[PDB]
Design a protein around this ligand. Structure first.
Ligand code: GAL
Ligand code: GAL
Ligand code: NA
Lengths: 339, 346
């Protein structure tokens, strides 16, 4: 079933219930996922109205871009030329700059295919918006099916050479309550290397490091508390995890990561080369979700994209988008329940 | 009463009915007016869904900007610096460039004051959008009261020195049918001068001309047919009117324009110095409005703003906006019945 309702400030909340009784909901404010629940438990973090996102934290569950992550000094080179993007975190451009696409109301259309329902959100980033060349016509389609698969497919076309590497910013918490750390979840992740951060500014350090046999090696399932209790300087630096992991084998058919808590597990599939993992290292901030005060480590992301820092480490990839070329990306989060 | 429902594509339709039974409606797609009816008759042009605006003509009834009108070659001078804006009509920048504010979904909040209801729409134009320095935090409040006044209040603040001069693009047609020409309406307009256009590109010619006693003189009420039938160079140039008229006396207190048909009148008040009048000179295009093919001259706008061309005719004004300075503008359209005797035949 599909239900559309007012979510506040003119935004809509679109809720989809599949044959299994699982409910997932989105909002056009930021082409974002708001909730995902089973047997009455939330599996992700989210708010109860549009105002909350705007007042508390506008990133959770949203589509972030045009470039996801931090860009050192807000600088990118396009066709050999230097362009300075909007700087909103000190001199860095984080998540596309201030007032970016996650804070805009996108238009959308719903398509019911029966076993699957799609919600296609669209937005135009005008040429020059926050320093980025354009215009870029973007669309993000979130879909949910009867097999409990939530898929995000992105597409974009630019009138001029530009940069483009968006991501989805859902935070999972299988405890179903923000006041509870995810340290009890088990994580598996098909990555043997990671990108260390330079310092507290969180820009990349410059190198690529092998994590095999370290506290960050999750090639074999392991509980998060391990990483959390590690003394690796990278863990200590951010007080948790806030880093890009390089996937060993690329392709949409491979389960790249798996998050498990008891009988409930989430599998991640993507066609992107990296997953940025951030464990809500918010200290005592205590943001409130559903009346529950969030705890440090009260959530975890799987941001699939090209690793941030390619401006300094080209080996990471190239986020250039040439005029007239069509950008495509796909990420899937699959829900499973043991029986 | 206030009612809200989906209008299509994620936009909503906000419908207000005042105590006199007059209803008016808006959409957050472009902070725009959709309809205004009295006794089951449409007083303005509009479509029945959001998609129609996007597929037929996205300007009607919209808030347009950041700069309304045409800027020659897209070039503006901001604090000694030259900036080139998005050019979407040949080398011209028309109504803020392509995919401008009229095409975005604005957020909104409704405030019920009893005798008055306000719908405040908000949007942020990011710095660099379409070449404009910003960011610019904008708000447009549309309000309707028990006295039949529809008021538009604009506010804006920029982080950077920029330019700002938006307007409202409503089109009236008191026939209530787009397929009926407005040449049968009577027009009174308190303006003695106008700004001629250079040519078909529609940029300003460079001079200001006195129109007293010509077919464009509406200081004293006359039927629109007088202008439409005129062979004056400017009218032939655009096949109707599409020009800025300079108000003779400024201030929100004065009735600057009055549009009448039979027993109904619309009066125009504004704090702006000019009114751009465009009479839907679309020829045979025939866009469908409520299944009626629109006729050439099937509509008339009263875009109140600083006249276009100040880039070339400094005397027209200055639309610059300094960083941190609060922009404000107010325009009001009021509806009356039996304000005067208007009984003609066409
Ligand atoms: O969503 C907010 C978070 O987003 C992550 O991508 C980022 O690395 C974190 O440091 C934090 O900013
Ligand atoms: O279609 C909207 C109209 O807006 C008027 O301001 C302009 O002068 C007309 O030529 C036309 O562009
Ligand atoms: Na809505």
């Amino acid at each position: 079933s599909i239900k559309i309702r007012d979510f506040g400030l003119g935004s809509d909340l679109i809720s989809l219930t599949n044959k299994a009784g699982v409910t997932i909901s989105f909002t056009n404010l930021g082409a974002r996922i708001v909730d995902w629940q089973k047997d009455g438990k939330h599996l992700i973090l989210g708010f109860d109205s549009a105002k909350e996102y705007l007042e508390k934290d506008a990133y959770p569950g949203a589509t972030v871009g045009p470039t996801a992550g931090r860009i050192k000094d807000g600088l990118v080179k396009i066709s050999g030329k230097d362009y300075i993007l909007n700087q909103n975190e000190g001199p860095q451009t984080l998540h596309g700059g201030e007032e970016s696409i996650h804070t805009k109301l996108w238009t959308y259309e719903v398509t019911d295919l029966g076993a699957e329902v799609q919600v296609k959100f669209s937005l135009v980033s005008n040429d020059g918006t926050n320093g980025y060349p354009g215009k870029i016509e973007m669309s993000v389609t979130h879909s949910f099916d009867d097999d409990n698969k939530w898929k995000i497919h992105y597409e974009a076309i630019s009138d001029k050479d530009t940069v483009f590497n968006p991501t989805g910013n859902v935070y999972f918490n299988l405890n179903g309550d923000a006041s509870e750390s995810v340290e009890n979840h088990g994580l598996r992740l098909a990555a043997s290397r990671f990108v260390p951060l330079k310092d507290q500014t969180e820009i990349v350090r410059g190198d690529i490091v092998d994590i095999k046999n370290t506290d960050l090696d999750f090639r074999q399932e392991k509980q998060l508390s391990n990483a959390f209790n590690s003394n690796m300087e990278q863990v200590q630096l951010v007080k948790g995890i806030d880093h890009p992991f390089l996937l060993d084998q690329l392709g949409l058919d491979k389960e790249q990561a798996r998050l498990t808590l008891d009988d409930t597990s989430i599998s991640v599939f993507t066609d992107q080369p990296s997953i940025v993992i951030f464990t809500a290292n918010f200290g005592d901030l205590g943001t409130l979700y559903h009346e529950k005060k969030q705890v440090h480590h009260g959530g975890i992301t799987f941001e699939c994209q090209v690793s941030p820092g390619s401006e300094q480490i080209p080996e990471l990839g190239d986020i250039s988008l040439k005029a007239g070329e069509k950008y495509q990306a796909t990420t899937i989060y699959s829900l499973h329940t043991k029986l």
